[PDB]
């Protein structure tokens, strides 16, 4: 891939990732999508690039598409449950509350991120 051969310098890739988030934060979702797709073409194996594109799909209400990428991101990161938390959100929106409950429960049981667990527990408290 382009990343394998260092086709673009590291600092310029950092810049592009930051610009992608600038677009996302100012609600320029179409431009952010182009940029996060560019990043994931450059390095499909970069968990934070994948999370950025998954965030785009989630904000576009493409919830299964986001959940799919969140599964890959979780797998590649191994011990970061943030993608599992966002998967739970996606499953709620897909009307799959038992799958969502499983996700938030997994965050509670495995995550060492205390702030993330507070958010997961709030979701669990509301699930019927």
Kindly list the residues in this chain that would bind its own copies in the complex (CB under 8 A): 37, 40-41, 44-45, 50, 53, 57, 62, 65, 67-69, 71-72, 74-76, 78-79, 84, 87, 99, 102-103, 106, 109-110
**Closest CB 94 distance from its own copies, rounded Å:** 11
Per-position x/- string for 61-100, each x denoting binding to Cl ion as judged by CB under 5 A, each - no binding: -----------------------------------x-xx-
**Closest CB 76 distance from its own copies, rounded Å:** 6
Q: Which of 8, 77 has the CB closer to its own copies?
A: 77
Q: Which of 18, 64 has the CB closer to Cl ion?
A: 64
The partner in contact with residue 74, picked from Cl ion, its own copies, none with C-beta cut-offs of 5 to 8 angstroms by kind, is: its own copies
Count the neighbouring beta carbons within 10 Å of the beta carbon of residue 14: 10
Q: Which of 114, 125 has the CB closer to Cl ion?
A: 125
Burial label for 121, CB within 10 Å (0-12, 13-18, 19+), is middle
Residue that has been written with the tokens 């897909």 in this structure: 94
Q: Which parts of this chain interact with Cl ion (CB under 5 A)? A: 96, 98-99
């Amino acid at each position: 891939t382009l990343k394998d051969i260092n086709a673009i310098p590291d600092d310029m890739m950092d810049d592009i990732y930051s610009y992608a988030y600038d677009f996302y934060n100012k609600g320029r979702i179409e431009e952010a999508e182009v940029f996060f797709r560019f990043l994931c073409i450059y390095d499909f194996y970069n968990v934070d690039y994948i999370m950025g594109l998954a965030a785009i799909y989630q904000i576009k209400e493409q919830f299964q598409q986001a959940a799919d990428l969140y599964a890959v991101a979780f797998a590649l990161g191994k011990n970061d449950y943030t993608p599992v938390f966002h998967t739970g959100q996606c499953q709620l929106r897909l009307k799959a509350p038992l799958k969502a409950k499983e996700c938030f429960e997994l965050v509670i049981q495995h995550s060492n991120d205390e702030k993330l667990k507070i958010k997961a527990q709030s979701y669990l408290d509301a699930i019927q």
